């Protein structure tokens, strides 16, 4: 199942819903303890983690440092130790069963900091900061290296990308993307890093490009049907799924699915309600 947690439509949301690509169904599961948008999702050891984000409510607006864990076998959330700082519009990635929290903002602060969570000790520790301040940063892991792609540094949107080596604890710039993108969906499919959609400061984007480590090169592939910023993305059974987002006018409920063998996108479902800034993962 494809799980989507949180998101934003007029205010931050609590929804946890899970899509079955065979059945077509959406399952309504336990609500997040706190409504959150701009968060990220990931899965370690079969548990689904919701990381960071921001609570936009009619009574307040607070960024979140929270880490929360959902168990599909109990349908229950339980909190985890929090990160050192709140991180709205975060990106995350998993290496060696550890969760890396990358970038994001806290108020006017635009993080370049990065921290690592270890589930078996419920502890966060800070690691080497990025070369760049990145909010709305896409994150993906390839061959146990951690890539941070695009984003917004507070003044400029970015097409640059950099790569973190866990065992040297350092970051190194890599080839930049063709397109400037903040709030894109970034994931690994087979052995290439995909960057889809986002916002360049002028338009929401439908273009998709992918990075090959062997040629250290970004190449465009088929674009999505719907331009969208702040979309969710994940990989299920060899295919990329992008969920919702914002196209400059509406918060989308469209879910598009990319097949790499045909290099084609199709709309496969609609979410129960349109939203942007979700966390998405598969377990």
From Swiss-Prot:
Residues where S-cGMP-cysteine occurs?
Answer: 108
Annotated Gene Ontology cellular component terms: actin filament; centriolar satellite; Cul3-RING ubiquitin ligase complex; cytoplasm; cytosol; endoplasmic reticulum; inclusion body; midbody
Q: Give compartment(s).
A: Cytoplasm; Nucleus
Q: How is it modified after translation?
A: Non-enzymatic covalent modifications of reactive cysteines by electrophile metabolites inactivate the BCR(KEAP1) complex. Accumulation of fumarate promotes the formation of cysteine S-succination (S-(2-succinyl)cysteine), leading to inactivate the BCR(KEAP1) complex and promote NFE2L2/NRF2 nuclear accumulation and activation. Nitric oxide-dependent 8-Nitro-cGMP formation promotes cysteine guanylation (S-cGMP-cysteine), leading to NFE2L2/NRF2 nuclear accumulation and activation.
Q: What is the effect of changing residue 152 to A?
A: Abolishes repression of NFE2L2/NRF2-dependent gene expression
Site feature: Sensor for electrophilic agents? 108
The record's note on quaternary structure and interaction partners says:
Component of the BCR(KEAP1) E3 ubiquitin ligase complex, at least composed of 2 molecules of CUL3, 2 molecules of KEAP1, and RBX1. Interacts with NFE2L2/NRF2; the interaction is direct. Forms a ternary complex with NFE2L2/NRF2 and PGAM5. Interacts with (phosphorylated) SQSTM1/p62; the interaction is direct and inactivates the BCR(KEAP1) complex by sequestering it in inclusion bodies, promoting its degradation. Interacts with NFE2L1. Interacts with BPTF and PTMA. Interacts with MAP1LC3B. Interacts indirectly with ENC1. Interacts with SESN1 and SESN2. Interacts with HSP90AA1 and HSP90AB1.
Protein name, entry field: Kelch-like ECH-associated protein 1
Which gene specifies this protein's sequence? KEAP1
- Full protein segment contained here: 327 to 609 of 624
